[PDB]
Structures are given as structure tokens and as C-alpha cells.
UniProtKB/Swiss-Prot annotation, chain A:
Residue pairs linked by disulfide bridges in the UniProt entry: none
Source species taxonomy: Eukaryota, Metazoa, Chordata, Craniata, Vertebrata
Shown stretch of the complete protein: 169 to 228 of 261
Name of the protein: Syntaxin-7
Subcellular location: Early endosome membrane
Source organism superkingdom: Eukaryota
Record's function text: May be involved in protein trafficking from the plasma membrane to the early endosome (EE) as well as in homotypic fusion of endocytic organelles. Mediates the endocytic trafficking from early endosomes to late endosomes and lysosomes.
Assembly and binders: Interacts with VPS11, VPS16 and VPS18. Interacts with VPS33A. Forms a SNARE complex with VTI1B, STX8 and VAMP8 which functions in the homotypic fusion of late endosomes. Component of the SNARE complex composed of STX7, STX8, VAMP7 and VTI1B that is required for heterotypic fusion of late endosomes with lysosomes. Interacts with TPC1.
Domain t-SNARE coiled-coil homology per the UniProt entry, residue ranges: 1-59
Curated annotation (Swiss-Prot), chain B:
Tissue: Widely expressed in all tissues examined.
Subunit structure: Part of the SNARE core complex containing STX7, VAMP8 and VTI1B. Interacts with VAMP8. Forms a SNARE complex with STX7, VTI1B and VAMP8 which functions in the homotypic fusion of late endosomes. Component of the SNARE complex composed of STX7, STX8, VAMP7 and VTI1B that is required for heterotypic fusion of late endosomes with lysosomes. Interacts with HECTD3. Interacts with TPC1.
Protein name per UniProt: Syntaxin-8
Mod. after translation: Ubiquitinated by HECTD3.
From Swiss-Prot, chain C:
Superkingdom, taxonomy of origin: Eukaryota
Tissue expression: Broadly expressed.
Name of the featured protein: Vesicle transport through interaction with t-SNAREs homolog 1B
Coiled coil: 22-60
Source organism (scientific name): Mus musculus (Mouse)
Function: V-SNARE that mediates vesicle transport pathways through interactions with t-SNAREs on the target membrane. These interactions are proposed to mediate aspects of the specificity of vesicle trafficking and to promote fusion of the lipid bilayers.
Localization (cell): Early endosome membrane; Late endosome membrane; Lysosome membrane; Cytoplasmic granule
From Swiss-Prot, chain D:
Membrane topology label: Single-pass type IV membrane protein
Lineage of the species this protein comes from: Eukaryota, Metazoa, Chordata, Craniata, Vertebrata
Chief location of this protein within or outside the cell: membrane
Stated name of the protein: Vesicle-associated membrane protein 8
Keyword Membrane attached: yes
Gene: Vamp8
Tissue specificity: Expressed (at protein level) at a high level in kidney, lung and spleen; at a lower level in testis, liver, brain and heart. Expressed in kidney and retinal pigment epithelium derived cell line.
Top-rank taxon: Eukaryota
Key words of the record: Antiviral defense, Autophagy, Cell membrane, Coiled coil, Cytoplasmic vesicle, Endosome, Lysosome, Membrane, Phosphoprotein, Protein transport, Transmembrane, Transmembrane helix, Transport
Location of the protein in the cell: Lysosome membrane; Late endosome membrane; Early endosome membrane; Midbody
The species this protein was found in: Rattus norvegicus
Site positions (Binding to STX8): R22
Length: 60, 55, 60, 54
């Protein structure tokens, strides 16, 4: 039963790996929200600079 | 026997994927660090211009 | 059939799902990478727009 | 071979565990970057406001 045992233990290890992928996958997906916010703050900063220049250009 | 062959092939893909992911994550952390630096510098230019405006 | 054959079959099933989670992860990281690159593009673009700010303020 | 499969599985566990560490690290780096972008967006609002005044 040593080969059987090694095979059965292999299964437990493969399940463990499946859970690691799921864990990695879950965090990658949730971190997507953080990236969404990063992109949004930058796009917002971009428009503000553009709006600010419109103003300065008018004051000139 | 044969079942191990099909399983071995499957696990084989896993390893390469694991390596691709690692390379991707490493590069992304570089990109993020690059961005932090760019944000910091742009934020400083912003501060400087806002000040000039008030002057 | 025995404990070994059935365990190998279950591992096959689990390992396949893991690979599928793997391609899902790779695809999602691809979208996130592009999102970070678009963010960078907008940021440097804004940085250059601040040079125009300086120019306009100089003419004040 | 069961011995080979065992070795490859240990290698996958090692690589993927390191990937989870890379993602835990990316989470920290993303939060840090997000804070910087909030500071950036804030400064841009001030810049816009000050420009509207002149």
C-alpha cells in the first residue's frame, strides 16, 4: 500500500494546490477594485489639470 | 499507469502557468513602483504650479 | 478498481479545474496590466500638460 | 511514475506559494500607490480651484 499511499497523499497535495490557485485568484480579483480606484484618481487628476489650464489660458 | 500520464500532463501545464504568473506579477510590481514614482513627481509639479498660480 | 485508481481520477478532475482557474488568473492579470499601463500613459500625459501650465504662467 | 509526479507537485506548491506572496506584496504596493493617487487628485483639485480664481 505504499504506492497507494503515495498516490492518495498526492491527491491531498493537488487539492492544496487547487486552494492556492483559488486564494491567489480571489485576491487578484479583489485587488482589481484598488486598481480601478488608482486609474480613476489619475483620470480625475488629468481632467483637473486640463480644466485648470483652460482657466489660466483665459486669464492670460 | 495511463491515468498517471493524463494527470502528469495536467500538472505539467500547471507548473508553466505558475511560472508565467510569477513573471507577470514580478513585472507588475515593477510597473506599480514605477507609477508610484511618477505620481510622486507629478504631484510635486502640481504643488509647484498651484503655488505659482497663487503668487 | 481500487483506492489508487479512484484517487488518480479525482486528482485528474481537481487538477483540470485548477488549470482552468489558472487561465482565468492569467487573463485577469492581463486586463489589470493594461489598466496600469493606461494609467501610466494618462499620468505622464498630465505631467507634460503641467509644462504648458508653467508656460502660461510665465506669460502672466 | 508516482515519484516524479510527487516532485512536480512539490515544485508547483512552491511556485504558487511564492505567487501568493507576490500577490500579498502587490496588495501592499497597490494600496501605497492608491494613497499617492488620492494625494495627487487632491492637489489637482486645489490647482483647479486656484486657477479659477485668477
Amino acid at each position: 500500500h505504499e504506492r497507494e499511499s503515495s498516490i492518495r497523499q498526492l491527491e491531498a497535495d493537488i487539492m492544496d494546490i487547487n486552494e492556492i490557485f483559488k486564494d491567489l485568484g480571489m485576491m487578484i480579483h479583489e485587488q482589481g477594485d484598488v486598481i480601478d480606484s488608482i486609474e480613476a484618481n489619475v483620470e480625475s487628476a488629468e481632467v483637473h489639470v486640463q480644466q485648470a489650464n483652460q482657466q489660466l489660458s483665459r486669464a492670460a | 499507469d495511463a491515468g498517471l500520464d493524463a494527470l502528469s500532463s495536467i500538472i505539467s501545464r500547471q507548473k508553466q502557468m505558475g511560472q508565467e504568473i510569477g513573471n507577470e506579477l514580478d513585472e507588475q510590481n515593477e510597473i506599480i513602483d514605477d507609477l508610484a514614482n511618477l505620481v510622486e513627481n507629478t504631484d510635486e509639479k502640481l504643488r509647484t504650479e498651484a503655488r505659482r498660480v497663487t503668487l | 478498481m481500487n483506492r489508487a485508481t479512484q484517487s488518480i481520477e479525482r486528482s485528474h478532475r481537481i487538477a483540470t479545474e485548477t488549470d482552468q482557474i489558472g487561465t482565468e488568473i492569467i487573463e485577469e492579470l492581463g486586463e489589470q496590466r493594461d489598466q496600469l499601463e493606461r494609467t501610466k500613459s494618462r499620468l505622464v500625459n498630465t505631467n507634460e500638460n503641467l509644462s504648458k501650465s508653467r508656460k502660461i504662467l510665465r506669460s502672466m | 511514475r508516482v515519484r516524479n509526479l510527487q516532485s512536480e507537485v512539490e515544485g508547483v506548491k512552491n511556485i504558487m506559494t511564492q505567487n501568493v506572496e507576490r500577490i500579498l506584496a502587490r496588495g501592499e504596493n497597490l494600496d501605497h500607490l492608491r494613497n499617492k493617487t488620492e494625494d495627487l487628485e487632491a492637489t489637482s483639485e486645489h490647482f483647479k480651484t486656484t486657477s479659477q480664481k485668477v
